[PDB]
Design an enzyme around this catalytic site. Structure first.
Site, PDB file in Angstrom:
ATOM      1  N   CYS A  94       0.876  -1.520  -0.075  1.00  0.00           N
ATOM      2  CA  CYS A  94       0.392  -0.330   0.154  1.00  0.00           C
ATOM      3  C   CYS A  94       0.603   1.200   0.273  1.00  0.00           C
ATOM      4  O   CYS A  94       2.514   0.794  -1.019  1.00  0.00           O
ATOM      5  CB  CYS A  94      -0.264  -0.279   1.521  1.00  0.00           C
ATOM      6  SG  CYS A  94       0.049   0.150   2.507  1.00  0.00           S
ATOM      7  N   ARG A 112      -3.346  -2.188   5.367  1.00  0.00           N
ATOM      8  CA  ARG A 112      -4.373  -2.443   3.671  1.00  0.00           C
ATOM      9  C   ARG A 112      -3.367  -3.907   4.259  1.00  0.00           C
ATOM     10  O   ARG A 112      -4.296  -5.121   3.668  1.00  0.00           O
ATOM     11  CB  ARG A 112      -4.423  -2.000   2.649  1.00  0.00           C
ATOM     12  CG  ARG A 112      -5.276  -0.688   3.197  1.00  0.00           C
ATOM     13  CD  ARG A 112      -6.763   0.318   1.984  1.00  0.00           C
ATOM     14  NE  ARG A 112      -7.674   0.566   2.095  1.00  0.00           N
ATOM     15  CZ  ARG A 112      -7.582   1.771   2.559  1.00  0.00           C
ATOM     16  NH1 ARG A 112      -6.267   2.426   2.087  1.00  0.00           N
ATOM     17  NH2 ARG A 112      -8.832   2.694   2.681  1.00  0.00           N
TER      18      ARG A 112
END
Lengths: 189, 200, 197, 201
Positions: free
Chosen positions: D128, D134
């Site tokens: 990310c 994430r």
């Protein structure tokens, strides 16, 4: 039958204290309307409006009478109304009184607290909770109440007692400067 | 004269019922007392707690001494009929002092001193309870007119009318004016009738 | 010397940052930086905080602000004259950068300014950390408050108050015992950023 | 479109963010976004992380990366061809924005993408902007859903490989909600020092 001294110009409520307690002066119901100008009224219906503008789950009444306002008008907003009568003769709330208050609030939403004017017995019990139940310093507790509900606890013996229990009695703040509505005079009509 | 008007919202003052009626004559000159309450309040005052004007004039007849003047320091005429004093040949005068909890002013004190220095006859003095404004004015007179020390005046009032002046700001101010402010006594020990409580 | 009128982006984490706290001890009003009309294309109307908003609040409270102390390091956010034209004295106090707590010099400078003064406004970019720190230094040093009372008062007025942990520790290091420092509160929700946005 | 060759600042909190974790379970390599030479005037030499640097490490290990999953929402940071020219498959997977946890759709997409890098093939790279939240979330969902790990083991494994691991509390909570018991979710770790920003700079 007659309204309490220093009430008319006493501010109605403080800011929420640590997002848990709302200090206020006693409400006076419509039965007192003849004795109180429109601009000085503080009916229960007014409290519920401000709340509607967060839910107050409990109101704790520290006064020694049920002649100021009808409790039902608090309860008809879904607010649990409890009386908690503290030791009289000008004494600080007792160890029993605080235990009762702390256990009471423990069941919790805001909690409303009022005595006659909403400063001394109200501040004392809130500060005791913050120290005992939330591990605040008594210094932060008293100061936080004074900010939320200026001038805060102003009765010298009450401040002294709170620091005796929860701090160093030598460190108790001096009684604060008093606002214009707040004064002691036996001859005042 | 409000004494003869509606009693609807006339309650007796807080802390009055068990407040002692009168002190001893102070320097044989001033008699301090709490306000009298006339028969109109009898439904609110047990017989054993009553203090009608008649009770004062009865005491005076016992002392075999005339009171020339009564100085009333309250801000109302609702408590008793001033004529119940005047019909006994006692001069009645209201002296309304500065409010908001303040000490009687330099004006208030001058007024009091000039009123009294016209009066052997006792001068009665009462506020609501007969300790703080009553004591302050008596002490100022003893110092300004009779050249007493403020230490002597304050202690004399406290002996005659225990606990004496107990409002701390009033004690400090008397010593500011008439002595050394550092030598002011702290508020005294309070008796059981005398307490501060907004919830009582 | 006034970049407001020359040629940028609004500061990060500013849009939903609360505008102002309650007056602290009847002396200080903490706030985030105002942004002038030039930034209105980047700020929705419900999020605007022009200098005029501050003075509208000051008229509302029926209280005069004597002094506004600006702790930011730029003049591009709002026209200082917008403050000064209301009779409010404007002064920039730039504190030590790079994460550092305000120095003793910074605090002494702050205290000197405030002694002249009516509310005193104090803002950094967001109105929590440097703003909180200097207000708390004043309260202890000039008004003989405990640091516990000061830090808690600011937290009540401007929740959660100072939220940098080392600022909190430093204040206790200087004005009490470092061991008594309360832990840093949760990072405010208005600080939240999605790193992929 | 490839915005790398268009018009411009580097991402915040990136310069001192660690480049790459340890490989996770011998299968995933978490990293922050690379920045191409276009950004060299904004990045001191000691802080540079060109795609070529990733390649040099992969050679250092004597191991192949089959696939790089980019979870960012831009193509401006580096030229994807700088990855592909090295024989590494490049795929963008844009997850729900506005602070949201990767959705059930996102996770399914990630899982199906990666299950081909055992099936037709090696490390799978995942990044990310910074390579923690994430990145960690999707790796952990894969470990649980596809490899039958406990969520406790997945989250701990990621924190060990890429310390302090996922540090956004809602992400941790949501992983425990899906794959374990929400009351067992660990509290957020401390915010990393590389995230520190002076608001008056």
């Amino acid at each position: 039958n007659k309204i309490p001294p220093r009430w008319l110009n006493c501010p109605r409520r403080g800011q929420p204290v640590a997002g848990r307690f709302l200090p206020l002066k006693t409400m006076l119901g419509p039965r007192y309307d003849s004795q109180v100008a429109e601009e000085n009224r503080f009916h229960p219906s007014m409290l519920s409006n401000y709340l509607k503008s967060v839910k107050m789950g409990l109101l704790v009444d520290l006064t020694n009478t049920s002649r100021f306002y009808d409790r039902n008008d608090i309860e008809k907003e879904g607010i649990k109304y409890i009386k908690l009568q503290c030791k009289g003769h000008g004494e600080c709330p007792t160890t029993e009184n605080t235990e009762t208050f702390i256990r009471l609030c423990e069941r919790f939403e805001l909690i409303g607290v009022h005595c006659t004017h909403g400063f001394n017995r109200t501040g004392f019990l809130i500060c005791a909770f913050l120290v005992e139940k939330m591990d605040w310093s008594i210094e932060a507790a008293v100061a936080t109440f004074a900010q939320a509900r200026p001038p805060g606890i102003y009765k010298g013996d009450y401040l002294k007692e709170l620091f005796r229990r929860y701090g160093d009695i030598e460190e108790a703040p001096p009684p604060p400067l008093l606002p214009d509505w707040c004064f002691e005079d036996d001859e005042d009509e």
